[PDB]
Design an enzyme around this catalytic site. Structure first.
Site, PDB file in Angstrom:
ATOM      1  N   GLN A 196       0.616  -1.271   0.095  1.00 35.40           N
ATOM      2  CA  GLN A 196      -0.163   0.010  -0.023  1.00 35.40           C
ATOM      3  C   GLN A 196       0.757   1.252  -0.241  1.00 35.40           C
ATOM      4  O   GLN A 196       1.928   1.158   0.460  1.00 35.40           O
ATOM      5  CB  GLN A 196      -0.912   0.090   1.086  1.00 35.40           C
ATOM      6  N   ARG A 199      -3.695  11.138   2.348  1.00 34.91           N
ATOM      7  CA  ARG A 199      -4.813  11.876   2.845  1.00 34.91           C
ATOM      8  C   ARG A 199      -5.748  12.610   1.849  1.00 34.91           C
ATOM      9  O   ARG A 199      -5.293  13.452   1.059  1.00 34.91           O
ATOM     10  CB  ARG A 199      -4.331  12.657   4.256  1.00 34.91           C
ATOM     11  N   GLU A 257      -4.512   3.553  -0.657  1.00 32.25           N
ATOM     12  CA  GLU A 257      -5.160   3.873   0.684  1.00 32.25           C
ATOM     13  C   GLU A 257      -5.313   5.001   0.887  1.00 32.25           C
ATOM     14  O   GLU A 257      -4.428   5.912   0.733  1.00 32.25           O
ATOM     15  CB  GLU A 257      -4.329   3.245   1.778  1.00 32.25           C
ATOM     16  N   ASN A 314     -10.282  12.153   6.952  1.00 32.15           N
ATOM     17  CA  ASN A 314     -10.784  12.590   8.360  1.00 32.15           C
ATOM     18  C   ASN A 314     -12.126  13.572   8.189  1.00 32.15           C
ATOM     19  O   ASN A 314     -12.039  14.460   7.448  1.00 32.15           O
ATOM     20  CB  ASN A 314      -9.667  13.477   8.904  1.00 32.15           C
ATOM     21  N   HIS A 349       5.039  11.485  -5.962  1.00 36.80           N
ATOM     22  CA  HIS A 349       3.936  10.968  -6.931  1.00 36.80           C
ATOM     23  C   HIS A 349       3.689   9.615  -6.782  1.00 36.80           C
ATOM     24  O   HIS A 349       4.495   8.854  -6.325  1.00 36.80           O
ATOM     25  CB  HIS A 349       4.183  11.278  -8.323  1.00 36.80           C
ATOM     26  N   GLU A 384       1.875  10.236 -11.963  1.00 34.00           N
ATOM     27  CA  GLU A 384       2.735  10.245 -13.254  1.00 34.00           C
ATOM     28  C   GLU A 384       1.998   9.193 -14.351  1.00 34.00           C
ATOM     29  O   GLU A 384       1.297   8.185 -13.869  1.00 34.00           O
ATOM     30  CB  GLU A 384       4.027   9.225 -13.017  1.00 34.00           C
TER      31      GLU A 384
HETATM   32  O1  LIG Z   1      12.957  12.189 -14.996  1.00 35.40           O
HETATM   33  C1  LIG Z   1      12.599  11.138 -15.444  1.00 35.40           C
HETATM   34  C2  LIG Z   1      13.319  10.596 -16.646  1.00 35.40           C
HETATM   35  C3  LIG Z   1      12.886   9.393 -17.080  1.00 35.40           C
HETATM   36  C4  LIG Z   1      13.605   8.843 -18.293  1.00 35.40           C
HETATM   37  C5  LIG Z   1      13.408   7.127 -18.416  1.00 35.40           C
HETATM   38  C6  LIG Z   1      13.923   6.810 -19.448  1.00 35.40           C
HETATM   39  C7  LIG Z   1      14.440   7.268 -20.293  1.00 35.40           C
HETATM   40  C8  LIG Z   1      14.635   8.713 -20.284  1.00 35.40           C
HETATM   41  C9  LIG Z   1      13.937   9.430 -19.233  1.00 35.40           C
HETATM   42  O2  LIG Z   1      11.883   8.509 -16.419  1.00 35.40           O
HETATM   43  C10 LIG Z   1      11.407   8.903 -15.115  1.00 35.40           C
HETATM   44  C11 LIG Z   1      10.420   8.149 -14.656  1.00 35.40           C
HETATM   45  C12 LIG Z   1       9.775   8.695 -13.603  1.00 35.40           C
HETATM   46  O3  LIG Z   1       8.978   7.846 -12.766  1.00 35.40           O
HETATM   47  C13 LIG Z   1      10.105  10.074 -12.741  1.00 35.40           C
HETATM   48  O4  LIG Z   1       9.452  10.188 -11.743  1.00 35.40           O
HETATM   49  C14 LIG Z   1      11.006  10.581 -13.583  1.00 35.40           C
HETATM   50  O5  LIG Z   1      11.065  11.840 -12.963  1.00 35.40           O
HETATM   51  C15 LIG Z   1      11.596  10.287 -15.031  1.00 35.40           C
HETATM   52  O1  LIG Z   2      -6.743   2.769  11.182  1.00 34.16           O
HETATM   53  C1  LIG Z   2      -6.552   1.758  10.567  1.00 34.16           C
HETATM   54  C2  LIG Z   2      -7.333   0.729  11.202  1.00 34.16           C
HETATM   55  C3  LIG Z   2      -7.339  -0.611  10.715  1.00 34.16           C
HETATM   56  C4  LIG Z   2      -7.895  -1.721  10.883  1.00 34.16           C
HETATM   57  C5  LIG Z   2      -8.538  -2.692   9.960  1.00 34.16           C
HETATM   58  C6  LIG Z   2      -9.240  -3.879  10.236  1.00 34.16           C
HETATM   59  C7  LIG Z   2      -9.605  -3.853  11.576  1.00 34.16           C
HETATM   60  C8  LIG Z   2      -9.269  -2.999  12.695  1.00 34.16           C
HETATM   61  C9  LIG Z   2      -8.430  -1.917  12.252  1.00 34.16           C
HETATM   62  O2  LIG Z   2      -6.470  -0.850   9.451  1.00 34.16           O
HETATM   63  C10 LIG Z   2      -5.561   0.060   9.013  1.00 34.16           C
HETATM   64  C11 LIG Z   2      -4.635  -0.236   8.065  1.00 34.16           C
HETATM   65  C12 LIG Z   2      -3.841   0.612   7.520  1.00 34.16           C
HETATM   66  O3  LIG Z   2      -2.946   0.237   6.763  1.00 34.16           O
HETATM   67  C13 LIG Z   2      -3.939   1.844   7.915  1.00 34.16           C
HETATM   68  O4  LIG Z   2      -3.283   3.036   7.536  1.00 34.16           O
HETATM   69  C14 LIG Z   2      -4.772   2.546   9.123  1.00 34.16           C
HETATM   70  O5  LIG Z   2      -4.838   3.423   9.539  1.00 34.16           O
HETATM   71  C15 LIG Z   2      -5.636   1.368   9.395  1.00 34.16           C
HETATM   72 ZN   LIG Z   3       8.108   8.593 -11.232  1.00 30.07          ZN
HETATM   73 ZN   LIG Z   4      -1.852   2.224   5.886  1.00 31.02          ZN
END
Ligand SMILES: O=c1cc(-c2ccccc2)oc2cc(O)c(O)c(O)c12
Ligand SMILES: O=c1cc(-c2ccccc2)oc2cc(O)c(O)c(O)c12
Ligand SMILES: [Zn+2]
Ligand SMILES: [Zn+2]
Lengths: 167, 175
Positions: free
Chosen positions: B27, B31, B93, B97, B120, B165
């Site tokens: 995950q 928010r 996730e 709030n 991102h 992205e």
């Molecule tokens: O600045 C980036 C440049 C390239 C890239 C990949 C293959 C050939 C040329 C450029 O990939 C990315 C991939 C991402 O997920 C990302 O957040 C990025 O900022 C870049």
């Molecule tokens: O506050 C949360 C409560 C529970 C939860 C799920 C099933 C039964 C009881 C509690 O799961 C979560 C899982 C997460 O990945 C997370 O970021 C969370 O903030 C919670």
């Molecule tokens: Zn990226």
């Molecule tokens: Zn969580």
């Protein structure tokens, strides 16, 4: 709420996949150690952009023997993997004692955490402890037990969870 | 500043401990101000499936788990449903709030301005230009259009302003 969920998404989206989550990291030396040694991820690829002064590190739960070595094959493979973590390194932040990143859990809030599912939260956390990992929430602490949060070297929160013991 | 050599970077990588062999990246949590806007954007526009919704009335928040999953694969029993949801790879996730939707003083920080951190999420698609043409038609807000700037790569904004992205793994090997 009730109407907001489109249950029949346009078919042009059927092959979309959630490929990455990007976090900025101060020091790839610490980050790579943490994600590979502690959490067991594999570095898929390192891409460098000299003109723009940054590098990208793509990590995932993948078998390194599956990764193509030729850089062009490697690139197409890396970007077609599911659930990668993209760590962005702006050159020089490691040697900049004024600089650090914001984890999103204090003002101003936004991003919260990434989360890793594990077979056994208690054993995993016991190992994290032995390795000197910093905790935000221990599995027993707080009362939502069996669920933990640790921190990576930049202070990003990582949830450690078991899918069955959430219930 | 010059960035790490390959040799430095790879030397800081260890092979995975066998005790982590079944770990999975499950995950990414964001928010969200308004669940109506966010769920519409992620299910209708981006095509994710809402796996599960959890409500916590005592604490006044809700959680939405979304993923690229076959909706017929979702278990009906709520114990089965929770374990399936939480064992899916690459879920989104969304944390709501209660009451943030109707507070015009409130908004969340997308991480791309001071103080920076999170950047991102990214979705791989068959054809960035085709995906973006549809986004344009659906009134999606863009950060970077594919033709503008690194062609063939795009960034859009979700209803909270988080950056998403849009990339094609088969053409990203072209800058
Ligand atoms: O600045 C980036 C440049 C390239 C890239 C990949 C293959 C050939 C040329 C450029 O990939 C990315 C991939 C991402 O997920 C990302 O957040 C990025 O900022 C870049
Ligand atoms: O506050 C949360 C409560 C529970 C939860 C799920 C099933 C039964 C009881 C509690 O799961 C979560 C899982 C997460 O990945 C997370 O970021 C969370 O903030 C919670
Ligand atoms: Zn990226
Ligand atoms: Zn969580």
């Amino acid at each position: 709420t009730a109407f907001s969920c489109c249950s029949d998404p346009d078919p042009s989206t059927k092959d979309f996949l959630l490929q990455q989550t990007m976090l900025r990291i101060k020091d790839p030396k610490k980050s790579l150690d943490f994600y590979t040694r502690v959490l067991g991820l594999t570095l898929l690829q390192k891409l460098d952009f000299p003109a723009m002064k940054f590098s990208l590190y793509f990590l995932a739960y993948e078998d390194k023997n599956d990764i193509p070595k030729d850089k062009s094959e490697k690139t197409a493979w890396t970007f077609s993997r599911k659930a990668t973590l993209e760590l962005t390194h702006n050159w020089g932040t490691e040697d900049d004692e004024t600089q650090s990143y914001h984890n999103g859990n204090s003002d101003p809030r936004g991003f919260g955490h990434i989360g890793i599912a594990v077979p056994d939260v208690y054993s995993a956390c016991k190992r994290f402890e032995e390795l000197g990992v910093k905790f935000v929430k221990k599995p027993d602490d707080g009362k939502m037990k069996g669920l933990a949060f640790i921190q990576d070297p930049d202070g990003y929160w990582i949830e450690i969870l078991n899918p069955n013991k959430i219930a």
